[PDB]
Amino acid sequence: NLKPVDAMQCFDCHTQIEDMHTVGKHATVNCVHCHDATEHVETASSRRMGERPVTRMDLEACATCHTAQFNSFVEVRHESHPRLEKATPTSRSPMFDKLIAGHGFAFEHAEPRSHAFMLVDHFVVDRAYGGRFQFKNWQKVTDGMGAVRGAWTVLTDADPESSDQRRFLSQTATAANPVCLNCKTQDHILDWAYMGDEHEAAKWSRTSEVVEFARDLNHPLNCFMCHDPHSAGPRVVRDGLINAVVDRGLGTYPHDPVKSEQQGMTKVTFQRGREDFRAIGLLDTADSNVMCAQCHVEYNCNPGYQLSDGSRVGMDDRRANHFFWANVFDYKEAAQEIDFFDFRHATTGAALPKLQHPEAETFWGSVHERNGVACADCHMPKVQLENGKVYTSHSQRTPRDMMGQACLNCHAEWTEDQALYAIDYIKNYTHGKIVKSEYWLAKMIDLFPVAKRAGVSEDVLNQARELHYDAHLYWEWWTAENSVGFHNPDQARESLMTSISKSKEAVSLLNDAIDAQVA
Amino acid sequence: NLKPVDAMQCFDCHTQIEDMHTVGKHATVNCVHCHDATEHVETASSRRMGERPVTRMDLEACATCHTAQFNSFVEVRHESHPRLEKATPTSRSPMFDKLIAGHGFAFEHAEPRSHAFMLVDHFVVDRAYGGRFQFKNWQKVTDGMGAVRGAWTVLTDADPESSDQRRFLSQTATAANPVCLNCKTQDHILDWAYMGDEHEAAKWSRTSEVVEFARDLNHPLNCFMCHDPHSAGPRVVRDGLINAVVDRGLGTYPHDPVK
Amino acid sequence: NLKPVDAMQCFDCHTQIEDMHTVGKHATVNCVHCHDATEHVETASSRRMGERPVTRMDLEACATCHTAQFNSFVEVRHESHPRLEKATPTSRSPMFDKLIAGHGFAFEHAEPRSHAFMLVDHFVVDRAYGGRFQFKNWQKVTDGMGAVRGAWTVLTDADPESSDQRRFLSQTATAANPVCLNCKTQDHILDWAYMGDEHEAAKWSRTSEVVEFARDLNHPLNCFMCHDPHSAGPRVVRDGLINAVVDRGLGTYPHDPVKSEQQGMTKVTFQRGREDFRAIGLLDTADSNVMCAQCHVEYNCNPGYQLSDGSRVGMDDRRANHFFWANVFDYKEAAQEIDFFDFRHATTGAALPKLQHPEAETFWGSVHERNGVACADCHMPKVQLENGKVYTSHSQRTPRDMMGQACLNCHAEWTEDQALYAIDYIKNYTHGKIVKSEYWLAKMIDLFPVAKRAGVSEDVLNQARELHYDAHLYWEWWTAENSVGFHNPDQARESLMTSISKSKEAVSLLNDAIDAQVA
Numbered sequence A, C: 001n002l003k004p005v006d007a008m009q010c011f012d013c014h015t016q017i018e019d020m021h022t023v024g025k026h027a028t029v030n031c032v033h034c035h036d037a038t039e040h041v042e043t044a045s046s047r048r049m050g051e052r053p054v055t056r057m058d059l060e061a062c063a064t065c066h067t068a069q070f071n072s073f074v075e076v077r078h079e080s081h082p083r084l085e086k087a088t089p090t091s092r093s094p095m096f097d098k099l100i101a102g103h104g105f106a107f108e109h110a111e112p113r114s115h116a117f118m119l120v121d122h123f124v125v126d127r128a129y130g131g132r133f134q135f136k137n138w139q140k141v142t143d144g145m146g147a148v149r150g151a152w153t154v155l156t157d158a159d160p161e162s163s164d165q166r167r168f169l170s171q172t173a174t175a176a177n178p179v180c181l182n183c184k185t186q187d188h189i190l191d192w193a194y195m196g197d198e199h200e201a202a203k204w205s206r207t208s209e210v211v212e213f214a215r216d217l218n219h220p221l222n223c224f225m226c227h228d229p230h231s232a233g234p235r236v237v238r239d240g241l242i243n244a245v246v247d248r249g250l251g252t253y254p255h256d257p258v259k260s261e262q263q264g265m266t267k268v269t270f271q272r273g274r275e276d277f278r279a280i281g282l283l284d285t286a287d288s289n290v291m292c293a294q295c296h297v298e299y300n301c302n303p304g305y306q307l308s309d310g311s312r313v314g315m316d317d318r319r320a321n322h323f324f325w326a327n328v329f330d331y332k333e334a335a336q337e338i339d340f341f342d343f344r345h346a347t348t349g350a351a352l353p354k355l356q357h358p359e360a361e362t363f364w365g366s367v368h369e370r371n372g373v374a375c376a377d378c379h380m381p382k383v384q385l386e387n388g389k390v391y392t393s394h395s396q397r398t399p400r401d402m403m404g405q406a407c408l409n410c411h412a413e414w415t416e417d418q419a420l421y422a423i424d425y426i427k428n429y430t431h432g433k434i435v436k437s438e439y440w441l442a443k444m445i446d447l448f449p450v451a452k453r454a455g456v457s458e459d460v461l462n463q464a465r466e467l468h469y470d471a472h473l474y475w476e477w478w479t480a481e482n483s484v485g486f487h488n489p490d491q492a493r494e495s496l497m498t499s500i501s502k503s504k505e506a507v508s509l510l511n512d513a514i515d516a517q518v519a
Numbered sequence B: 001n002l003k004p005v006d007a008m009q010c011f012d013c014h015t016q017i018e019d020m021h022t023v024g025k026h027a028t029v030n031c032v033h034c035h036d037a038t039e040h041v042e043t044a045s046s047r048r049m050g051e052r053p054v055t056r057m058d059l060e061a062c063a064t065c066h067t068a069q070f071n072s073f074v075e076v077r078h079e080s081h082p083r084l085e086k087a088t089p090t091s092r093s094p095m096f097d098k099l100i101a102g103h104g105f106a107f108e109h110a111e112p113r114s115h116a117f118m119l120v121d122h123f124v125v126d127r128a129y130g131g132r133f134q135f136k137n138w139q140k141v142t143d144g145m146g147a148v149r150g151a152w153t154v155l156t157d158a159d160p161e162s163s164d165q166r167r168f169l170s171q172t173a174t175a176a177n178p179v180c181l182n183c184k185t186q187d188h189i190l191d192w193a194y195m196g197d198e199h200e201a202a203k204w205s206r207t208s209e210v211v212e213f214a215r216d217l218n219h220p221l222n223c224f225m226c227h228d229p230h231s232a233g234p235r236v237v238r239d240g241l242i243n244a245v246v247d248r249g250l251g252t253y254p255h256d257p258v259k
Ligand code: HEC
Pocket: A005, A006, A007, A009, A010, A011, A012, A013, A014, A031, A035, A037, A038, A040, A041, A044, A045, A046, A047, A048, A049, A052, A053, A054, A055, A190, A271, A272, A273, A274
């Protein structure tokens, strides 16, 4: 059984914790729930840590007093089909392999499934660790509760004796690096300096051996990613997000200065040896738009190249951990501002961006966002009980499972079937334009080898490569983004029509040049 | 927001609470969750209460850290048919009126329904208070969460100016007395001496005016009826049961001395 | 009404029948249930048949005493979508037409449906008889009971006056031959010599006119294919299977000598004019793995060519009726051992194998097979009755229809939804790798005409053709095999990664050679 410690002892040295803990809704929650600091207190001085206290990062540390929220979070949605490859005719991107050739996602890119699995799925996907990690057997894929208890309770490592990234099966890649883990877990929150910069007090950084780092990590989506454990107040902890909102002064809502001021973020910094070490962003309000934007954004979390001179941009570079914080029509400018692209297309040779699930940036300026609706209203609504204490569902999933709470309370004019029909109208229309964008991109890509072999000039090929950048960006945003247009239907429409226009322009350019060589 | 108090200072006088609280699974749960003792601490000695501290008996005191248990308790089972008289051909006792004639249960004896309603149902049944108490209207019969928040949030008293047991409608009885309430609530746990015997320190006893007692009670089946709030360990609080098992030496299983 | 005959009369001449019938569970079942032998007994001698007795092969001969098993067998699973072409984007092999070009399956290859239809479906598929046979009208496609009563009760022949294989509609083929029928019916069990070799006593053989043979056949999947009618004991009757297990000494479990000895097969031969004529394989145990392996295997049942010199291998050759009895990683060696391939790819010119539903060979060495599980545990389980005599379901279908009996009795840790999710994880992952294997095969195939037209050498084209053999084998095994990886997920994964590797190797070889011609 837990025995309480005297927090006044701690507060003598930890004045920021004192100011947060004594004022918030955890003022009565004793430190012993999350820290074992007995030897620390015996050996610390006001400026030296002494013995390092143990800090619990397991979700069960919160589940004892908050069982309803924990249980709602860990539920597995079995209807969210698992390990389902997107590069198939029945999924999001039928022509993905041709369009993405040259990039590591060609090795595997599955649809998302329930949050319980995020860390294990990151470890086992074919593009990440060369197939080094597997579930202990194929039965363990069902075990959401086990994954939450810890990745290493359900996974195996093919070679515990080595720590290098290498292929263990032929059709795998080794794309994973330490930046990735910041959107899968924050078990490393006390061991990673802000942005992953080198730091004397940091065990792990952008340049660490990712296999060694992985072995130290266990829990998905820690509860404290959105809730300060000391004040219980709303926050973010993701470095890249704090960097965009606060350091670069872009604001929580870059298109709306007023909403940014009402619903802002305050950066709180913690030091080691009196040098800045790590930071959090305290939110003015419990704003799920910004909480979910810790991960559901377009980002760099990988090495790349410079647009200017084509030189390698390695993990050591700050740009390898970056939130662009830009909508699809501002993205090219944002990538130019850091002089960066992701890969060269294997067929066309074009410098190209790689887009990641940009839900937050897509949602900006949409009808729902403009009306003050937030991710949680549709994806984590309040539970409705005939007789009960209301709490917020933490099962972050499609509103199709809870249409009464997620849609119909606001849309009183609709039945469930009518609201579903409105969603499908948007998704069907947008998916049609995605498929057409892919048809035109593929037609363009396939002309590159024909043009090369016909002796078309490098100048013409480079003109087509510049068009490929835009044709790609204005398509891939929408196969990356998970709502199939629902979050912003007009923007999806405008972007996908632009993609098709760019590809058609490139097709015309190449066809004419090929024909001129033939004559 | 709650601010914790110095529990060690309490323990200078409260040695039984100290022994229970420091050892069990509520050792880290501060007294401020259930007690407002600021003036008490200022005025008490080990031999004098001073100002009486406030003690919370509402179930929400536990629901903050144990929402799953609270929500499962308060749920209303709509299939448990409400206000269903047992003395009918389709219920438990078709000839109950003839057989029970002379007893107060002849005025009304319904089948049980969900625990959330036990205190309000005790107050409104025709055999108990002469029909003095009613739900505010016939819609309120559904409101389990409201009854749990407190009986007087969902009930009305026909005559707040009098405190006597009498009939307000002809076919009612006044069978209720203070002993009844021990199986409906323990809001009176600090105001009732063991067995309801007369005691200088008891506001309420077996001989109190039950209408006055009723007005002072709010919550059904308090969570602490089965769980000690200090140790979190298993217990009972009902005097009559402790009297049978312990005082009269019958044991928890009178037919099995080993068990 | 049936009148019993004196079996002692028969036993004077039929001593093998005596030894089987008098000992087994049909010792009390009189010969008249299945034979009309009155004139036979009047005219036979100990070595000459005289008048041929009539033998019933209709399933109703068993249904009188075994109605439960019969009714469970004949049930139509309407959820098993009928006449569904696999070469479509929503089915098993979206790029099948490009990959299989040159082979008769390009004319039609539908998904399987319920066993009641196997003989009629064989007769009416577009690749088989040139469209000669049809159901009497499009309503008859529903009539499972009618198909079981007899194919010719529900089918019509476009030209009863001719017996040649020819096209009756333009986009059909005439792939059917007498070997095919051995996996659709055994009505011919007394009229076909072992392996279909020429024999004086055999009415039909590998070289027969298949249209004439077809007209003589009526019933699907006779009950006696797995149960000896005389002893009632477990057996197989399929010649190709007996040949692999017994004649070639490969064993019932080629990867496990011990299991092969515990669960073995005894070949029993019957003679005509004191010369070996036909055979059965009596099983040591009621082993559904080996019973279902009569048909659910990779096989030759067709003419082909020699790998060594490219010469035709006709129906007259023993190799036209062959069970390879080899897993995917042993198959190439098995085809080399008989010097055989199926077709030349229409685009690449590569010699290629054609793979057939290799469920039995895929199941070997899988986790379930290693734990002593058999096909019937998941596809024909015991019926569970609150009050009833237990029998074995004969409705051989997906375990999704009976998850309680097929999975959950063994997997107590799972709900039905969890077990379904585990199946889908495997099928989704494997199908993703199938689609990727097809993408790479298609990319390779499409380079052949480009290379040819650029003047690439025959030596390079032949190197690519050798790679095509392996790229094809390691892909097609999995579109042929019906579990979409479930029966052996690790093997599917290893094979499909090998396919992709081989195709990528060939793409690189051809691209480099084309580029060298251009420069
Ligand atoms: C002064 C003598 C201290 C006492 C009393 C307590 N802590 Fe401490 N702590 C102290 C220092 C100098 C440091 C290094 C960081 C800094 O602020 O200078 C720490 C660090 C921690 C940590 C972080 C550990 C990590 O892994 O990075 C924790 C969780 C922590 N301290 C907790 C803690 C508790 C619970 C205390 C009361 C029991 C406590 N500290 C007392 C200095 C001092």
